Every structure is written in structure tokens, then in C-alpha cells.
Design a protein around this ligand. Structure first.
Ligand SMILES: [Zn+2]
Lengths: 75, 343
């Protein structure tokens, strides 16, 4: 299945993933396309920040679900 | 005349977040009247949140030391590190999520207060199809780099993008990737609408995050009409009640907030603002909102040399448009009353 990603500049991209992919896989696949290292990334789907170690299925996100890429203006 | 929040070491974000929640009266009263259960989640936090919210209101002292709150606060999996700098908007989602998860009474309050719905719609150019869906949100991120204001940002957030090439659609009713134009827009707007002006870019040559300091303005009263599903495809005018300023660079910084007093009707009717900086709250002249939050360049008279402003708004808080009586646990009031007597 393919999900949507609104990247750091607001660009919508597409990602071909399988729901049994883990979040670290998605951050790796995001690094592949938009070139951002996986550890600096936060991914926010439908309000719930996805955390490392759980499954893309554990958040119940499917085709045409949009992931939001942000960094940390960590003050 | 306001009560601040002691810095435990690196809880800049936490003070900014608690005080803004505290100043939204619906949420203050919501946290107050929340009914303790037994198997409710984050029981200790709602409990500690109540004592804090009561101390903030009725205490005669300068600041409440938020350590009892922080020692039981859990973030991701592990307990909260009071020495770890954190992203304010991150901590904001963390706490709003918890409060939502505490009781279904609160969830319905939080979603209605801070939650919204984006509807984004895909239409295919070489097909006969369409797949509009729904998205839930709490905070709306705004592009800041190469944007002059938040109206430009929203114009880009609700833009008509063209899915093409490396990012083709895959029509599910057609088993093939298709030319499609997708656009998002707002279906349900929240009562308290939060924006995240992301003031950073990731530099591709130097492999490093780079804080964005360009000028970026936002109105005191906002009209959200041109981004509602009714315009594309009650009231949409909002009033700025809060700005969360971040001072510093991409490696770390410091936080503080300019919050509007929307409680006392005389303070509210005369546009009285206040600077919440950790254990220190001071009155704030709204004439310097633009300077203190918009970014850009300053000049000084060093000895004349102009640098870039590294202090700018990271988060905006707007209340939708349309004398509060708070019901607080009397046992808690006598707590605060006993302590108040010495001062
Ligand atoms: Zn089709």
C-alpha cells in the first residue's frame, strides 16, 4: 500500500510501505526519498506521534493515510 | 499578580505549555471538574495537574515548583527527564493526548476544544475516479521559509498539488498509477486553533538542521474562511490569545510565552498581555508583539550593525469567536489557603 507524506517543505510525497513495517523502517524509507536522517525525524499521523519500536499497523494507518514529517525545534 | 512555574533545569517547554492550557478557561475548568476514576489512565498526572492548576490560580506565591508533576510524568515510555530540552509542540501533543485518554468526558472536551478535521481530496486526470478522505488534527504546521505571513502559509497548506511522476497516485479502483491533483482543506476547525510555524530547514550540504529566522507575521484577528471546505470544494474569525516564542539556534534554546488574559473581562476588553517566562510573569505591551515574535533583522547601535533575530514565534494560539466561575475541589482550596497565610 502507499501512504502520503507531507515533508519538511510541505511537499506531498508517496511511500510504498506494508503495514507490518516498523516506524524505523519508515524513517529509513523516508531517508531514501527526501534524504533526512531517521533519528532527527518525528512522524505525526492524525494527531498521534508515531514512536520508534511499534508497527505501522499498531496505529491503524492504511492507504491514503498521511504522515507528517517534522524536526525538533527542541528548545 | 500571576503565578509562574519554576524551571527544574530544562522545563522551558513545560512551563509554556501548562500556562497556555491554564489560561484557556474551558480547559482550566475541564481539568478542575475532571472526575477521578480507578482504572483511568494517567490518574497521577490528572491529579498532579489539578493541584498545579489550583496553585496557579489561588496561591499568593510567585511560582509553583512543578516537580511533583514532573516526577510522575511519563513521556514515550520512560519517566520525564527534567534536564532534557524538548520541543514545546511535542510536549503539547503529549499532554493533550494523555488528557484525552483519561476519561471519555475529557476526550470529548479535548477533541472539541483542540481537535479539528482536514478533508483532503484526490481527483484523477486520466481517470473517472475520486478519493476524498478525512484527517484528524490538533496542530496545523505552517511553512515559514519563503513565506511572509500565515495567510501565505495557509494558502500553501490548502494548495492544489499535482501528484505526478515519482509521486503518482495508484488509483485503487484501477491498479495503475495516475496523474492526480490533491488538495487539503479544513472541515471542522477547533475552538482553540493552534499553529506550528516550523522555523527550521534541514541543510542538504551540511547535513544539519538550520533554524529559520526570516520575518513572518500573523494577524491579531484571523479570518479562516478561505480554507474551509464550505469555500473550496459557525464562525471562522479567530482572536490571537497566545504566542510561544523560541529564542536561540537549532542546537537548543529557551522558551517563553506571551499569553492574552481572556478571563478578567476588563483585562480582556483592554487587550492586556503578559509575558510568561518560567518563574517570572510580567505585563507585556502588545505594541511590541511584532518585534518580539515576527523575526527579521534588528539593527542596534553597536559601539551600527544589523544581525538576524534568533527569537521568534514557534507556536500560535487562537480562540474562535462567538467573568468565569471555576468550581475547584474545596479540599484543594483549604490546602492553598493554609500555605497562603504565611504570605
Ligand atoms: Zn482510476
Amino acid at each position: 500500500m502507499q501512504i502520503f507524506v507531507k515533508t519538511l517543505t510541505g511537499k506531498t510525497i508517496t511511500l510504498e510501505v506494508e503495514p507490518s513495517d516498523t516506524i524505523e523502517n519508515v524513517k529509513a524509507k523516508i531517508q531514501d526519498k527526501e534524504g533526512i536522517p531517521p533519528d532527527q525525524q518525528r512522524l505525526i499521523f492524525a494527531g498521534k506521534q508515531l514512536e520508534d519500536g511499534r508497527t505501522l499497523s499498531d496505529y491503524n494507518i492504511q492507504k491514503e493515510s498521511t504522515l507528517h514529517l517534522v524536526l525538533r525545534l527542541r528548545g | 499578580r500571576f503565578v509562574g512555574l519554576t524551571n527544574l533545569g530544562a522545563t522551558c517547554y513545560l512551563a509554556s505549555t501548562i500556562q497556555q492550557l491554564y489560561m484557556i478557561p474551558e480547559a482550566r475548568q475541564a481539568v478542575f471538574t475532571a472526575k477521578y476514576s480507578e482504572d483511568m489512565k494517567h490518574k497521577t498526572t490528572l491529579l498532579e495537574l489539578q493541584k498545579m492548576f489550583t496553585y496557579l490560580m489561588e496561591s499568593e506565591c510567585k511560582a509553583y515548583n512543578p516537580r511533583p508533576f514532573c516526577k510522575t510524568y511519563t513521556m514515550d515510555k520512560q519517566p520525564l527527564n527534567t534536564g532534557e530540552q524538548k520541543d514545546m509542540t511535542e510536549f503539547f501533543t503529549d499532554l493533550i493526548t494523555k488528557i484525552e485518554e483519561m476519561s471519555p468526558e475529557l476526550k470529548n472536551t479535548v477533541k472539541s476544544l483542540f481537535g479539528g478535521v482536514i478533508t483532503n481530496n484526490v481527483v484523477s486526470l486520466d481517470c473517472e475516479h475520486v478519493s476524498q478522505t478525512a484527517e484528524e488534527f490538533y496542530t496545523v504546521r505552517c511553512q515559514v521559509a519563503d513565506m511572509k505571513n500565515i495567510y501565505e502559509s495557509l494558502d500553501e497548506v490548502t494548495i492544489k498539488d499535482t501528484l505526478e511522476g515519482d509521486n503518482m497516485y495508484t488509483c485503487s479502483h484501477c491498479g495503475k498509477k495516475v496523474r492526480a491533483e490533491k488538495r487539503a482543506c479544513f472541515k471542522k476547525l477547533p475552538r482553540i486553533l493552534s499553529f506550528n510555524t516550523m522555523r527550521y530547514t534541514f541543510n542538504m550540504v551540511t547535513m544539519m538542521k538550520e533554524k529559520v529566522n526570516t520575518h513572518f507575521s500573523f494577524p491579531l484577528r484571523l479570518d479562516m474562511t478561505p480554507y474551509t471546505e464550505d469555500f473550496l470544494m459557525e464562525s471562522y474569525e479567530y482572536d490571537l490569545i497566545g504566542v510561544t516564542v523560541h529564542t536561540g539556534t537549532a542546537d537548543g534554546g529557551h522558551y517563553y510565552s506571551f499569553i492574552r488574559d481572556i478571563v478578567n473581562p476588563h483585562a480582556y476588553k483592554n487587550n492586556k498581555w503578559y509575558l510568561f517566562n518560567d518563574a517570572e510573569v510580567k505585563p507585556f505591551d502588545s505594541a511590541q508583539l511584532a518585534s518580539e515574535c515576527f523575526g527579521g533583522e534588528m539593527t542596534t547601535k553597536t559601539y551600527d550593525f544589523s544581525f538576524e533575530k534568533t527569537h521568534s514565534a514557534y507556536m500560535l494560539f487562537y480562540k474562535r469567536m462567538e467573568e468565569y466561575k471555576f468550581d475547584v475541589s474545596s479540599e484543594l482550596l483549604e490546602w492553598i489557603w493554609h500555605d497562603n497565610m504565611q504570605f
